[PDB]
Every structure is written in structure tokens, then in C-alpha cells.
Design a protein around this ligand. Sequence first.
Ligand code: HEM
Ligand code: HEM
Ligand code: HEM
Ligand code: HEM
Length: 107
Amino acid sequence: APKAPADGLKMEATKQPVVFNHSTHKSVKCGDCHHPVNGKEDYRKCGTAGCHDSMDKKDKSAKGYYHVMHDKNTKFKSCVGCHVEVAGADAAKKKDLTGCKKSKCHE
Ligand code: HEM
Ligand code: HEM
Ligand code: HEM
Ligand code: HEM
């Protein structure tokens, strides 16, 4: 069994790094993120060669690194997509979880 890394994983392929914590996501199945590939949950870095390596943010197909972290209507849920769903219409949760600035994700 794969073990979940500690907290404080820095995601830094772009100019706006974000910190991922496995602890605050304990209510999500590993599989909602480390999703099935060729019938089998894949645990390599999202941005691996042949995976979401398209660094062109005005690129909307399955390969886009920006797309998979922010887009709605994606087969598996993006960071922003699932957060929009958790926040509902609560203004405080929308700012912390879905805000583009001054949120838990981006300064
Ligand atoms: C519409 C709302 C948002 C805007 C406009 C925004 C904008 C951006 C931009 C411009 C970048 C850098 C992409 C590059 O230059 O190639 C980025 C990266 C990123 N954003 Fe956002 N962001 C938003 C909200 C959020 C939130 C709330 C989350 C998390 C739940 C988040 C997760 C990320 C991730 C994980 C990265 C990539 C980190 C890296 O590897 O450097 N974003 N975002
Ligand atoms: C016990 C539960 C889970 C397992 C076993 C697990 C395991 C892992 C492992 C082994 C890595 C490091 C991979 C690498 O850098 O080689 C990883 C990274 C990370 N995990 Fe998970 N995780 C689980 C749940 C989650 C969930 C629910 C999500 C989000 C809600 C998540 C999102 C990520 C992200 C985005 C990374 C960093 C990927 C990269 O740096 O590109 N994980 N986790
Ligand atoms: C934490 C890890 C990862 C994240 C956050 C992530 C995110 C996503 C999202 C949101 C989608 C749907 C895109 C859309 O519908 O347009 C997707 C699909 C896809 N991703 Fe990932 N991904 C990760 C890891 C991987 C890696 C390592 C691979 C390659 C082995 C991979 C290959 C694919 C493929 C092939 C698709 C289409 C899946 C299908 O059509 O069943 N993903 N991913
Ligand atoms: C790369 C992956 C994503 C990013 C970067 C990310 C970022 C984080 C952030 C920064 C927090 C606030 C707590 C802390 O700082 O750790 C958090 C909260 C959480 N996220 Fe994510 N998230 C991601 C994926 C998603 C997805 C895909 C889901 C589930 C499908 C989700 C569900 C939640 C929930 C339920 C919480 C707790 C909200 C509450 O305590 O306020 N997240 N996320």
C-alpha cells in the first residue's frame, strides 16, 4: 500500500506555487485524484511526461496542466471544481477555497 506523503507538498511547475496537504483531504478517496489510468489508480506526479505536461494554459484538452487544476466539466474533479462543490454559496468558504487571490491556494 502506497502511503500518503506528509503535508507541505509544494506544487511548483508554474509561477504560482501551491501547497498540498494530504491531511486536510482525508475525506476524499485517493482515487478522486490519483485516478485510474489503464484500469489502475496512477500515483505519479500529475505533470509527468505523457500525463498533464501541456504547459500552455490556453489549452483545454485532457493534457493541460492548468486545465486539470482549475476547469469544471472534466471527467475527474479539478482542485477548483471539487472546491466549488464543497463551498456552495457560503461567502467565507468561496473565498478560502475558490478565490484567485487571498485564498488558501494563492496569495
Ligand atoms: C479562477 C480561479 C484561479 C485563478 C485565475 C488562478 C490562476 C492560476 C494561474 C494563473 C496559475 C499559474 C499557471 C501558469 O502560469 O502556467 C495557477 C496555478 C495553480 N493553481 Fe490557480 N488560480 C485560481 C484558483 C485556484 C485555487 C482556489 C486553487 C486550489 C484549489 C488553485 C490551484 C492551482 C494549482 C494547483 C496550480 C499549479 C501549481 C504549480 O505547479 O505551480 N488555483 N493558478
Ligand atoms: C492515502 C491516500 C492517498 C494516497 C495513498 C496518496 C499518495 C500520494 C503519493 C505516494 C504521492 C507522491 C507521488 C510522487 O510525487 O511520486 C502523492 C502526491 C500528491 N497527492 Fe496523493 N495520496 C492520496 C490521496 C490524495 C488525495 C485525496 C488528493 C487530493 C484531494 C491527492 C493529491 C495529490 C497531489 C496533487 C499530489 C502531488 C502530485 C504532484 O506533485 O504532481 N492525494 N500522494
Ligand atoms: C494527482 C494527480 C493527477 C491529477 C490532479 C489529474 C487530473 C485529471 C483530471 C481533472 C482529468 C480529467 C481531464 C478532462 O476531463 O479534461 C484527468 C484525466 C486524465 N489524466 Fe490525470 N491527473 C493526475 C495524474 C495522472 C497521471 C500521472 C497520468 C498518466 C499516467 C494521468 C493521465 C490522464 C489521462 C489519460 C486522462 C484521461 C482519463 C480518462 O479519459 O479516463 N493523470 N486527470
Ligand atoms: C491539487 C489538488 C487541490 C488543491 C491544490 C487543494 C488545495 C486545498 C487547500 C489549500 C485546502 C485548505 C486546507 C489546507 O490548506 O490544506 C483544501 C481543502 C479541502 N479540499 Fe482541496 N485541493 C485540491 C483538490 C481538491 C479536490 C479534488 C477535492 C475533492 C475531490 C478537494 C476537497 C477539499 C476539502 C473537502 C477540503 C476541506 C475544506 C474545509 O476544511 O474548509 N480538494 N484543499
